[PDB]
Each structure stands twice: as C-alpha cells, then as structure tokens.
Design a protein around this ligand. Structure first.
Ligand SMILES: N#Cc1cc(O)cc2cc(-c3ccc(O)cc3)oc12
Ligand SMILES: N#Cc1cc(O)cc2cc(-c3ccc(O)cc3)oc12
Lengths: 9, 225, 225, 9
C-alpha cells in the first residue's frame, strides 16, 4: 500500500 | 535552489485539509477511536503525496523512502495537529469536524495522558509564536531526520531543509543571539513530538490488538511496520 | 552566571567513570544483562549527584527534579556511552573494562538492534567531531529538556545551557552561518538518542519480565517512572 | 530511593 502510493500519482 | 524557494516548494507540498464527514455529536470510546483512526488513514494517503513533493525525496532509494515514512508518520501527524491547534488554546484540532477537549480524552483509557502531552507541546509552540514557514521546515525535517549513494542524497536534503529553517529565522530580523536561541528552542521541541509519538502509537497498537478500532489498510500497514 | 562559567561548572560536575569488570568467561545472555544493569545502577547514583550540580536544578521543585530524572535517565546514560565510544568505531565503551563489540550483542535477545542504533548515532557524532565542551552542554540540555513559577524557572535554565552551547560553538571560530548549522546538526541528534532510549528501556523491561536479569531498587524505580 | 538520593545525599 505504502509502496504503490510511492510509485503512482 | 535558495532557501526561500525551497520553503516555497514545501508550502506547495502541503496536504489538503481533511475532514472525516461526521455530523456534530458527543464522543464515546468507540466513536472517538474510530474517528481518530479513520482520520489518520486519510491523512496518511496525503502524507505520502506530500513527501514525494519534497525536492529529492523520490530520488532516494525506494528502501529509504519507505523506511523514513514508516518511522516518522505518527510524528508528522502530531506535528500537523499541533500547528492546527496553535490558535485554539485548550483544544486539539484533529480536523474541522473532529475538535477534542481535554476532558473528552477521559472517555478513552490511556489517551488523556497523551492529550496532555500534545496540549503542552502545542502551548509551547504557541508561546514561541511558531510561524507557518518554520512549521513547514520542521515538519520536513521530522521526515528526513527520522533515520536510525541514496545516503548522501538524504544528508544533502536534510541539510537543505535545515538551511531553510535558519533562513526563515533570519528573516524575522531578531537579534543574532535570539536567532540561535530560537533555532535551539524549536528543535528541542521535536524531542517532545517524538515522545508523544511513541506513546501515541503504543496506545494505538494496544487498540489494534483488541480489534477495538475498524480495519484501515494503509494505517494498519504503517502501524505493523 | 556567564556561559563560560556554566560550562566550567558542568566540566567540574562530570561524574567519575564507573569501574565495572567484564565477566571472566565470554558473555551469556544473563551475564551481559547483569553487567549492564549493575553499571546502570552505579551510574544512576552518580547521575543524581551530577544533576544537583547543574545550575538552578536544585532550585526547581522536588517533583520537577524527579520528573526530569525519571524521564531522561536512560537518554543521559546513553549519551555518556556514545561520548565514551566516540573514538572507537564499531565499539561501545560502557566502561573502561567493559568494551562490547557490536558482535557480542548476539547473546542477548533483541539488544543487537539497540547496539546498532547506538553505534550509528556515535558515528554521526564522530563525523561532526563533537567536542567535549559541546557534549557537556548537550547532556545537560537532555536533562533540562525532558519536561515529558518552577515551570518558568526550567525554561530559563534550559536557555542558560543553550546560551552556553552557542558560546562554545562560536569559540570554534567557524562562520556565523556555520555556527547555526552546527547547532542544528547537534540538536537534531537528540531525537535519535531519545529514540534509542525508548527502545533501551523497553528492552530492559522486557528482560525483567522474562526474568533474564533481576531489576530492583533504584534501577527498577527509574524503569517504572 | 530516587527521592532519598535527591534530598538525603
Ligand atoms: N493522542 C492520541 C492518539 C491515540 C490513538 O490510539 C490513535 C491516534 C491517532 C491520532 C492522530 C490522528 C490524526 C492526526 O492528524 C494526529 C493524531 O492520535 C491518536
Ligand atoms: N543497548 C542496550 C541496553 C539494553 C538493556 O536492556 C539495558 C541497558 C542498559 C544500558 C546502558 C547502561 C549504562 C550506560 O552508560 C549506557 C547504557 O544499555 C542497555
């Protein structure tokens, strides 16, 4: 979750 | 990038104001914890976007980006709470529709302790007349200094934000000795933020284990890590 | 009391090094914790004496003195530990004949982690080339900043030690701007010390409940706070 | 004990 928000906008 | 422009980028990174969509009404131990956790979850999403808007953050290794956010999230949430509460003595402005009184923290065991800690530190920032731009620098520093190639990038960034805070203080035009005194006073308050932080999470963790508060994906993950 | 006299006073107030001997045979989980708790108790006694020598400390109410010490004792112990290990990378000098290698921390469940963050913070202090005079001021600041007409007297005491730290840094000769940056860099490390402290005390309580080592009297009272 | 060292010593 934290990771997918760090790699998407 | 000058300090003034670095601070402008922090201002531009500021997350939007968040509300929990809750019709005004009294608080119980369940309705409070549920509101606080629901708010924390929404703010966490915005916190991730905020971090990415800090010049250089996305240049760090994905491993560093994740470690910095997993360790400081609660402190960053509490720093924001204190800045929103600065103009409302005696109150903790978690959100427009989530304003809590000290005596309302008595509806939840172990939280009145933390509220007092947050209200005290808030009153301290109020006494220092914390400015918005200092708030911005301090919040960014919390994220970048929560660390316990990409390494030097981090140091460079932390140094840049520190230089921005010094600059902000220098603009207030106060005495040089008073500028140093102010710099030290603001930074010493961060220990009290990190303290209310570790306490706030211990409390939340105990709450999770009891399944008292609903399941929030991002928050649950941030908590577990 | 000028900054220089405050510093000289702290210099003289420095507690003597507590001598503790390393067990004959290689450390076991229990003998290591025995050595650490035995050292802490003796150092705690000297810490109290040291505190009463900090200008204005005895003028605070007895209850403020107690809250300050209960809240920062481990932080103080570790700051001293880090200073003693400053010129010994990969080594933690708990005491003259109690030099623990990062490795020996494997016999104790969950202490290696704490040893790592302690070693990390030490390297940072080393990298900044922390000076004896600065160190004295920071340790005193740690005690006075743990507020986790007496309350007002505390604020004045903290400002006095802070003025002393600023004075020490200026005597280094670096540019005014670099003095601000050094002040910021040093204080930003208090967060890391406070963090390690939290883990350290958490770990000690863990060990006590596990019955890994007996913890009583002074040490125990400080643990419960 | 803490109080003792603080006030008695
Ligand atoms: N104090 C406190 C506290 C205790 C707890 O169990 C959970 C939470 C969550 C928050 C919280 C939520 C949103 C913020 O912007 C700041 C703090 O504060 C908490
Ligand atoms: N690391 C660690 C650690 C873990 C623990 O359970 C107890 C202790 C006590 C100390 C300790 C003792 C004396 C010092 O001058 C500094 C630190 O370190 C500890």
């Amino acid at each position: 979750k934290l990771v997918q928000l760090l790699t998407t906008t | 990038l000058s300090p003034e422009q670095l601070v402008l980028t922090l201002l531009e990174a500021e997350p939007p104001h968040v509300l929990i969509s809750r019709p005004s009404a009294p608080f119980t131990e369940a309705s409070m914890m549920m509101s606080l956790t629901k708010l924390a979850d929404k703010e966490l999403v915005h916190m991730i976007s905020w971090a990415k808007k800090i010049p250089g953050f996305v240049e760090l290794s994905l491993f560093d980006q994740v470690r910095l956010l997993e360790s400081c999230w609660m402190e960053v949430l509490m720093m924001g709470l204190m800045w929103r509460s600065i103009d409302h003595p005696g109150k903790l402005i978690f959100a427009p529709d989530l304003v809590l009184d000290r005596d309302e923290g008595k509806c939840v065991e172990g939280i009145l302790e933390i509220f007092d800690m947050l209200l005290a530190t808030t009153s301290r920032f109020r006494e220092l007349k914390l400015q918005h731009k200092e708030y911005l620098c301090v919040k960014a520093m919390i994220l970048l200094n929560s660390s316990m190639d990409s390494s030097r990038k981090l140091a460079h960034l932390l140094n840049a934000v520190t230089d921005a805070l010094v600059w902000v203080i220098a603009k207030s035009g106060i005495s040089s000795q008073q500028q140093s005194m102010r710099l030290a006073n603001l930074l010493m308050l961060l220990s009290h933020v990190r303290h209310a932080s570790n306490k706030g999470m211990e409390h939340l963790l105990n709450m999770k284990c009891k399944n008292v508060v609903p399941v929030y994906d991002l928050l649950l993950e941030m908590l577990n890590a």
